[PDB]
Amino acid sequence: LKNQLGHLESELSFLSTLTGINIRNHSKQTEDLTSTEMTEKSIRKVLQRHRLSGNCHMVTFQLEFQILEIQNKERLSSAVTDLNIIMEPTECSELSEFVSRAEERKDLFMFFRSLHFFVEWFEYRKRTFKHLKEKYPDAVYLSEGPSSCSMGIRSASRPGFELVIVWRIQIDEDGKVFPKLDLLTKVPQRALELDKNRAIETAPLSFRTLVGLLGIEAALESLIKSLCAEENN
Amino acid sequence: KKRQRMIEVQDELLRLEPQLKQLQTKYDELKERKSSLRNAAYFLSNLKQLYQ
Amino acid sequence: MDETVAEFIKRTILKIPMNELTTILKAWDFLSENQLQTVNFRQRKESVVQHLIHLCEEKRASISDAALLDIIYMQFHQHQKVWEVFQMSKGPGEDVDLFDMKQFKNSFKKILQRALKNVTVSFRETEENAVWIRIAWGTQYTKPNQYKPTYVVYYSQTPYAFTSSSMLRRNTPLLGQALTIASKHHQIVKMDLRSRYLDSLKAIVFKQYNQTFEDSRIIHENIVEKERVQRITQETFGDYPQPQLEFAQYKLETKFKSGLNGSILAEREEPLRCLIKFSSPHLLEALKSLAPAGIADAPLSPLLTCIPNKRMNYFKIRDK
Amino acid sequence: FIID
Amino acid sequence: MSVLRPLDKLPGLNTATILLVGTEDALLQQLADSMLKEDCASELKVHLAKSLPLPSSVNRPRIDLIVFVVNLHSKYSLQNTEESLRHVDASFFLGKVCFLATGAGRESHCSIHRHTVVKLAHTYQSPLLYCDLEVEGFRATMAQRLVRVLQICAGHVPGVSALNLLSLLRSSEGPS
Amino acid sequence: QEALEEKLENVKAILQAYHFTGLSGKLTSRGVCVCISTAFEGNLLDSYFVDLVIQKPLRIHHHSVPVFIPLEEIAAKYLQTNIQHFLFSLCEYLNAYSGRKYQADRLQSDFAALLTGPLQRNPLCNLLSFTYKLDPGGQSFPFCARLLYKDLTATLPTDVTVTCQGVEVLSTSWEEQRASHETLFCTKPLHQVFASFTR
C-alpha cells in the first residue's frame, strides 16, 4: 500500500503539470431526494455536494456546487443546479465581472478553462516585466509591481514626457480569452505646437499594427530602445 | 475523344484553382504588410523628431 | 409501365431469401401494411413474384422507387461487393467548409446529366446522416446498366469515401472528380485499401470501434522465453477486438543477402521481383497466434503490425 | 524497410 | 559453456525426469499431461524444452531421458533437431535418447520422408518409434510407453541397465 | 493501515473530482489516455477518450472523437509546440460539438410540434434550416430561418437570415418581427429563445 500509493502520487504529479490545477482538499457528501410517490419506472435522484479547495499556479479558488442526477431506465441525464464562488481579494480585479456571469450561466467548465487561460496570459506578464525591469532599471518604472493594471516609461532627467501602456484582459462569450493592448501618451501643451505631423492623434492605431506584425514583446521593446540613445546632451 | 478532352480541362480546372487562391491571400497580406510598415516608419520618424 | 425496369423489380424478389423478406419491405415503407399481410409469404416463391408485381403496378413505381429498393437490399447484404477507399484533400487557405444537403443533391445531379445523357441518380439518407448513392452507367444509346450498379458511401462531413468497384473502369476518373466538386474539395487521391466487409472498413479507418475500454511437475525451463514471445503481441495487438481485413498484396522487388551462404547469388546485381498475397479471413488476429506457437520470431516484423496504423494493405518493399 |  | 551431460550431479531419492524437446507447445503439453494419469512408484518431473542448447540454469536435476519429438508435417522440427544433436555428448547415445515422429497416421499431407528419420537414427544409433498424438486413445498408449523407458533409464529395476535398453531396441536389415 | 487507507481515499476523492473539472486520466504503459467531459448550461453528458503517447515524436493511436471535424490539421499545428494547449483546444471544440448537438435534441423533442415540414441536418451543424409557424395576432406566419455559422469555436450564431415562405404584403408588423428574430438569435441561445416563443 506504500507502492500502490506511490504510483498514484505520480498521477497526481502528472495531472498537476498537465491540467495546471492542484486540488488540496475535497469532501464527499451524499444526499438522497427520492420522492415518495408510486409510479412506473421510478427515478432515483442523486444529489452530490462537493467542496473544491484548490489553487492555480499563482491564484487560489473555492467552489461550492451540487449536482442533481436523474437516474431513469429510459434516458440518462444529470443537471448542475446550484453554483457558488467564494472569492478572495487578489492581485487582479478585472476577473470579478466573470464571477457574476458564471453564476447566472451556471457552467463551471467555462469557469475552469478560462481562469487557467487568464493565468496563461498573466504568467506571460511575469516573464515580460521581469525582462523589461531588469534590462532598463532607470527608465521603466512600475507602480504596482509586475501584477499591476498598467505600466509606464519615465525619463530620468526629462520629467514631462511619459508614455503609459495599458494591458487589459477581456473575456467574451465565445469561450476565448483575448488581451487588448492600448497606448496613451503624456505630452503637455508646449509640444503641441512643436508637432505638425499629427502622429499623436493616430498613436494607438499605429501601436496596434506593431502588435499584429512584429509581436507583443517586440512592440514593447521597440518603444523603449528607439526612444533612448540620444547621447548628444 | 471529346469526353477525354472534357475530363482533362476539368482536371486542369482543379489544377489552376488553389495556387491563385493562396497567392491572392498572400497578395492581400503583403499589401497589408507594406501599408502597415510605411505607416509605422512614418510614425517612428515623427516620434523621434518630436523627441529631438 | 416499362418492361425493362419491371424486370429489375422481379429480380430483387428472386435475390432475397424468405426469412429476411419482411425486413426489406418494412424498411422500403412505400406499400401500406394491410397489403403486406394480404400477400401470403408462406407460399411458393414464384407466387411472391406474381403477387408483388400487382402491387407495384397499382401504386405506379418509378425508376427511383425501384432503385430505392436496391439500396436497402445492399445495406443489409454488404458481403457481395468490395469497397475501395477514396481520400479527398483539404486545400490551403481554408479553415471551415460550407456543406448543405440541398446544395449537395443538385450539384451532384447537374454534374452527371451534363457529362452523359443517361445516368440514373438515386439517393437515400440513413442514420447519422450518411448519403447512399447509386449510379447506373449508360453510354450514349441504351437505358443504363441495371444489372451491374455502382455504389458510393459518403458520411456528409468526412473527406473519406467508400466506393465499390465498377465493371466499367473508364468512368472511374469521372466518378471521383464529381464527388470532389460537389463536396467543396480540390484534390482526389485513390488510396489503396479494399475488403469485402464495409462494417470492418469503417472500423479500421475511422478508429472509433478498435478500442472500447475506459504442481512443480509440469514446470518449464524456458522462463526467459515463454513470456517474451507474448509480450510483443500484448503491447501491439493484445486481446482487444480488431477489425477484419482479408487481403494484403505485398509487391517485393528486394534482393538476396545472408551470412550463411557465400556462393548463392553473391554476384547478382539484378532485383528479384516478387508479389505476395494473403488470402485468409480475420488476418489481424490470425498472425498473433504464431508467436506463442513457436513457429515465428518474437521480434515480429513491423510490416504486419502497421496495417491498422498506416491505413493501407498494398505495400512496396525495397531491400538490398 | 521504407514504403514508397 | 552451454553443454549437456547426463552425469554431473545426483539424481535424488526415487525421483527421475524427462526432457521433452519439440517445437509445438500445444502438442507436447497434452503428452505431458497424459503421463501424470498413469500412476507409478516414482515421482515424475516433466521438463519442456524448445531447442538445444539450453540456457544455463542451476536448479536442474540429473537428466535420465531426452526425447526428441519431431514432426513429419514440419521441416522446422527437423532443422532444430539437427542443431540439437550437435551440442550433445556421446554418453547420451548409450540407450538414453528416444525419437518420436508425430504425424505418421496421415500419409496424404506428410512433409518429410520416412527414410530420412531412419537414416538420421541409423548413423546416430537411436531407436525410432512412430505415433500420432492427435488421438487421445493413441496418446495414452504413448504416455504408457514413456514411463517404461524411464523405469530403465533411472535404474528402478534390477539387472537391466541403460545400455541393455540399447541392445533390445536395435534395428538392422536382413543380410540375405 | 488506517492511516494509509485514509490517505488512499483522499486520493480517490481528488481523482473523482478530476472528472468534474473537465479532463481526467490515468497513466498507461502505452502513453496516456485523457477523457474529456463537456457540458452546456449546466447539463453534461458522456466523455470521450483521447490516447496520447509519451515518446518522441508525438503520434496519435486512437480516439473516440468523430472525424466529422478534421483532427489532422489541428494535430500538425497545436500538438507540436505545446501539450496542454492542444488538449484545452479540443475541450473547446468538443464543447462546441456537443453544444450544437444539445440544441438539435431539444428541437426534435419539445419544439417539433411548432415546426412544419422536414428538417435537413448536417452533423457539424455549421448550416441549419428549419421552418416554423407562430401566431402573433391570430394569423399563421411560416418563418423559414437559416442559421449559418462563421466561427467554428463558438456556440452563438453570427449569420442569421430569416425569410418568410407565405405572404409578405402586409403592414409593419412582420418587419418588426423579422428585426426581433435577428436580434434574439445572435444574443440569445437557441433553447432559451424557443421557451420565449411559448411566452
PDB file of C-alpha atoms in Angstrom, chain C residues 173-309:
ATOM      1  CA  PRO C 173     -11.897   9.284 -63.016  1.00  0.00           C
ATOM      2  CA  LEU C 174     -15.351  10.679 -63.857  1.00  0.00           C
ATOM      3  CA  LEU C 175     -16.920   9.351 -60.635  1.00  0.00           C
ATOM      4  CA  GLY C 176     -14.061  10.577 -58.435  1.00  0.00           C
ATOM      5  CA  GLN C 177     -13.899  14.211 -59.513  1.00  0.00           C
ATOM      6  CA  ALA C 178     -17.710  14.544 -59.460  1.00  0.00           C
ATOM      7  CA  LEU C 179     -17.633  13.842 -55.710  1.00  0.00           C
ATOM      8  CA  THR C 180     -14.760  16.337 -55.346  1.00  0.00           C
ATOM      9  CA  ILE C 181     -16.545  19.407 -56.777  1.00  0.00           C
ATOM     10  CA  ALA C 182     -19.914  18.861 -55.044  1.00  0.00           C
ATOM     11  CA  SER C 183     -18.314  18.382 -51.594  1.00  0.00           C
ATOM     12  CA  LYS C 184     -16.038  21.510 -51.889  1.00  0.00           C
ATOM     13  CA  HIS C 185     -12.613  19.882 -52.250  1.00  0.00           C
ATOM     14  CA  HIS C 186      -9.751  20.321 -54.702  1.00  0.00           C
ATOM     15  CA  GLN C 187      -7.845  17.012 -54.826  1.00  0.00           C
ATOM     16  CA  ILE C 188      -8.910  13.364 -55.080  1.00  0.00           C
ATOM     17  CA  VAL C 189      -6.430  10.629 -54.094  1.00  0.00           C
ATOM     18  CA  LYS C 190      -7.307   6.967 -54.646  1.00  0.00           C
ATOM     19  CA  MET C 191      -5.968   5.257 -51.513  1.00  0.00           C
ATOM     20  CA  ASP C 192      -5.222   1.543 -51.942  1.00  0.00           C
ATOM     21  CA  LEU C 193      -7.266  -0.415 -49.381  1.00  0.00           C
ATOM     22  CA  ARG C 194     -10.091  -2.868 -50.103  1.00  0.00           C
ATOM     23  CA  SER C 195     -12.110  -5.599 -48.375  1.00  0.00           C
ATOM     24  CA  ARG C 196     -15.496  -7.300 -48.629  1.00  0.00           C
ATOM     25  CA  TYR C 197     -16.827  -6.122 -45.230  1.00  0.00           C
ATOM     26  CA  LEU C 198     -17.985  -2.495 -45.172  1.00  0.00           C
ATOM     27  CA  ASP C 199     -18.531  -2.578 -41.391  1.00  0.00           C
ATOM     28  CA  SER C 200     -14.893  -3.564 -40.824  1.00  0.00           C
ATOM     29  CA  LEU C 201     -13.508  -0.953 -43.244  1.00  0.00           C
ATOM     30  CA  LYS C 202     -15.252   1.792 -41.269  1.00  0.00           C
ATOM     31  CA  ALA C 203     -13.680   0.361 -38.097  1.00  0.00           C
ATOM     32  CA  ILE C 204     -10.063   0.328 -39.315  1.00  0.00           C
ATOM     33  CA  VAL C 205     -10.141   3.834 -40.872  1.00  0.00           C
ATOM     34  CA  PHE C 206     -12.369   5.907 -38.567  1.00  0.00           C
ATOM     35  CA  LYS C 207     -10.734   4.214 -35.453  1.00  0.00           C
ATOM     36  CA  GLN C 208     -13.832   4.546 -33.252  1.00  0.00           C
ATOM     37  CA  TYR C 209     -14.529   0.792 -32.943  1.00  0.00           C
ATOM     38  CA  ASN C 210     -10.990  -0.511 -32.285  1.00  0.00           C
ATOM     39  CA  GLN C 211     -10.661   0.402 -28.579  1.00  0.00           C
ATOM     40  CA  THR C 212     -13.638   0.017 -26.224  1.00  0.00           C
ATOM     41  CA  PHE C 213     -12.071   0.391 -22.760  1.00  0.00           C
ATOM     42  CA  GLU C 214     -12.396   3.096 -20.105  1.00  0.00           C
ATOM     43  CA  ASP C 215       2.282 -28.583  -9.328  1.00  0.00           C
ATOM     44  CA  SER C 216       6.045 -28.400  -9.842  1.00  0.00           C
ATOM     45  CA  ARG C 217       5.895 -31.419 -12.183  1.00  0.00           C
ATOM     46  CA  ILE C 218       4.862 -29.582 -15.382  1.00  0.00           C
ATOM     47  CA  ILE C 219       7.348 -26.750 -14.807  1.00  0.00           C
ATOM     48  CA  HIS C 220       9.137 -25.172 -17.778  1.00  0.00           C
ATOM     49  CA  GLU C 221      12.829 -24.369 -18.007  1.00  0.00           C
ATOM     50  CA  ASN C 222      12.065 -21.609 -20.543  1.00  0.00           C
ATOM     51  CA  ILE C 223      11.288 -18.829 -18.087  1.00  0.00           C
ATOM     52  CA  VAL C 224      13.035 -16.219 -20.266  1.00  0.00           C
ATOM     53  CA  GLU C 225      11.326 -17.490 -23.454  1.00  0.00           C
ATOM     54  CA  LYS C 226       7.653 -18.074 -22.544  1.00  0.00           C
ATOM     55  CA  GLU C 227       6.509 -14.562 -21.608  1.00  0.00           C
ATOM     56  CA  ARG C 228       8.925 -12.962 -24.090  1.00  0.00           C
ATOM     57  CA  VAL C 229       7.052 -14.300 -27.138  1.00  0.00           C
ATOM     58  CA  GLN C 230       3.705 -12.931 -25.924  1.00  0.00           C
ATOM     59  CA  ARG C 231       4.783  -9.537 -24.530  1.00  0.00           C
ATOM     60  CA  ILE C 232       5.246  -8.101 -28.039  1.00  0.00           C
ATOM     61  CA  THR C 233       1.734  -9.165 -29.081  1.00  0.00           C
ATOM     62  CA  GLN C 234       0.153  -7.600 -25.976  1.00  0.00           C
ATOM     63  CA  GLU C 235       1.853  -4.218 -26.435  1.00  0.00           C
ATOM     64  CA  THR C 236       0.911  -4.123 -30.144  1.00  0.00           C
ATOM     65  CA  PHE C 237      -2.212  -6.262 -30.718  1.00  0.00           C
ATOM     66  CA  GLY C 238      -3.444  -7.509 -27.337  1.00  0.00           C
ATOM     67  CA  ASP C 239      -6.624  -9.434 -26.604  1.00  0.00           C
ATOM     68  CA  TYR C 240      -8.746  -6.478 -27.785  1.00  0.00           C
ATOM     69  CA  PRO C 241     -11.237  -6.767 -30.680  1.00  0.00           C
ATOM     70  CA  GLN C 242      -9.786  -5.860 -34.075  1.00  0.00           C
ATOM     71  CA  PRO C 243     -11.295  -5.017 -37.484  1.00  0.00           C
ATOM     72  CA  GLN C 244     -11.349  -7.582 -40.278  1.00  0.00           C
ATOM     73  CA  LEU C 245      -9.049  -7.408 -43.300  1.00  0.00           C
ATOM     74  CA  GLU C 246      -8.661 -10.474 -45.513  1.00  0.00           C
ATOM     75  CA  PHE C 247      -6.348  -9.277 -48.298  1.00  0.00           C
ATOM     76  CA  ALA C 248      -2.867  -7.760 -48.475  1.00  0.00           C
ATOM     77  CA  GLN C 249      -0.752  -7.789 -51.639  1.00  0.00           C
ATOM     78  CA  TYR C 250       2.968  -7.296 -50.987  1.00  0.00           C
ATOM     79  CA  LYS C 251       4.932  -6.263 -54.095  1.00  0.00           C
ATOM     80  CA  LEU C 252       8.585  -7.074 -53.382  1.00  0.00           C
ATOM     81  CA  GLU C 253      11.467  -6.041 -55.647  1.00  0.00           C
ATOM     82  CA  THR C 254      14.024  -6.923 -52.955  1.00  0.00           C
ATOM     83  CA  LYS C 255      17.394  -8.671 -53.250  1.00  0.00           C
ATOM     84  CA  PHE C 256      19.027 -11.651 -51.533  1.00  0.00           C
ATOM     85  CA  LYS C 257      21.756 -11.245 -48.903  1.00  0.00           C
ATOM     86  CA  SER C 258      22.594 -13.547 -45.997  1.00  0.00           C
ATOM     87  CA  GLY C 259      25.517 -14.599 -43.829  1.00  0.00           C
ATOM     88  CA  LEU C 260      25.021 -18.355 -44.248  1.00  0.00           C
ATOM     89  CA  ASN C 261      25.668 -18.745 -47.993  1.00  0.00           C
ATOM     90  CA  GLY C 262      28.725 -17.252 -49.664  1.00  0.00           C
ATOM     91  CA  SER C 263      28.198 -18.617 -53.174  1.00  0.00           C
ATOM     92  CA  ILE C 264      24.402 -18.305 -53.593  1.00  0.00           C
ATOM     93  CA  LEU C 265      23.599 -15.073 -55.531  1.00  0.00           C
ATOM     94  CA  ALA C 266      26.895 -13.487 -54.471  1.00  0.00           C
ATOM     95  CA  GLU C 267      27.374 -11.774 -57.859  1.00  0.00           C
ATOM     96  CA  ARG C 268      23.782 -10.772 -58.684  1.00  0.00           C
ATOM     97  CA  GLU C 269      23.015  -7.067 -59.083  1.00  0.00           C
ATOM     98  CA  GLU C 270      19.566  -7.642 -60.644  1.00  0.00           C
ATOM     99  CA  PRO C 271      16.471  -7.353 -58.403  1.00  0.00           C
ATOM    100  CA  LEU C 272      14.361 -10.390 -57.507  1.00  0.00           C
ATOM    101  CA  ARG C 273      10.789  -9.354 -58.292  1.00  0.00           C
ATOM    102  CA  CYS C 274       8.002 -10.932 -56.223  1.00  0.00           C
ATOM    103  CA  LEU C 275       4.363 -10.466 -55.287  1.00  0.00           C
ATOM    104  CA  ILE C 276       2.977 -11.917 -52.048  1.00  0.00           C
ATOM    105  CA  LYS C 277      -0.788 -12.025 -51.461  1.00  0.00           C
ATOM    106  CA  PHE C 278      -2.592 -13.084 -48.284  1.00  0.00           C
ATOM    107  CA  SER C 279      -5.935 -14.869 -48.775  1.00  0.00           C
ATOM    108  CA  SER C 280      -7.335 -15.770 -45.339  1.00  0.00           C
ATOM    109  CA  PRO C 281     -10.156 -14.279 -43.231  1.00  0.00           C
ATOM    110  CA  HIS C 282      -9.543 -12.293 -39.984  1.00  0.00           C
ATOM    111  CA  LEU C 283      -5.788 -11.922 -40.620  1.00  0.00           C
ATOM    112  CA  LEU C 284      -5.082  -9.413 -37.816  1.00  0.00           C
ATOM    113  CA  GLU C 285      -5.865 -11.902 -35.048  1.00  0.00           C
ATOM    114  CA  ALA C 286      -4.661 -14.861 -37.138  1.00  0.00           C
ATOM    115  CA  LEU C 287      -0.998 -13.790 -37.096  1.00  0.00           C
ATOM    116  CA  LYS C 288      -0.937 -13.247 -33.312  1.00  0.00           C
ATOM    117  CA  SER C 289      -1.169 -17.000 -32.606  1.00  0.00           C
ATOM    118  CA  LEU C 290       2.056 -17.881 -34.450  1.00  0.00           C
ATOM    119  CA  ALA C 291       4.276 -16.261 -31.793  1.00  0.00           C
ATOM    120  CA  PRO C 292       3.154 -18.465 -28.810  1.00  0.00           C
ATOM    121  CA  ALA C 293       3.199 -21.419 -31.237  1.00  0.00           C
ATOM    122  CA  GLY C 294       6.983 -21.112 -31.600  1.00  0.00           C
ATOM    123  CA  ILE C 295       6.922 -21.070 -35.416  1.00  0.00           C
ATOM    124  CA  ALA C 296       7.621 -17.317 -35.603  1.00  0.00           C
ATOM    125  CA  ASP C 297      10.157 -14.978 -34.046  1.00  0.00           C
ATOM    126  CA  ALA C 298       9.275 -12.794 -31.053  1.00  0.00           C
ATOM    127  CA  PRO C 299      10.753  -9.681 -32.779  1.00  0.00           C
ATOM    128  CA  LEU C 300       7.861  -9.595 -35.250  1.00  0.00           C
ATOM    129  CA  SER C 301       8.256  -7.523 -38.420  1.00  0.00           C
ATOM    130  CA  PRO C 302       6.596  -4.062 -38.467  1.00  0.00           C
ATOM    131  CA  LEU C 303       5.036  -4.620 -41.920  1.00  0.00           C
ATOM    132  CA  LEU C 304       2.371  -6.886 -40.386  1.00  0.00           C
ATOM    133  CA  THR C 305       1.658  -4.555 -37.435  1.00  0.00           C
ATOM    134  CA  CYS C 306       1.270  -1.220 -39.280  1.00  0.00           C
ATOM    135  CA  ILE C 307      -1.877  -2.428 -41.097  1.00  0.00           C
ATOM    136  CA  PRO C 308      -4.451  -0.594 -38.854  1.00  0.00           C
ATOM    137  CA  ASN C 309      -1.878   2.199 -38.383  1.00  0.00           C
TER     138      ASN C 309
END
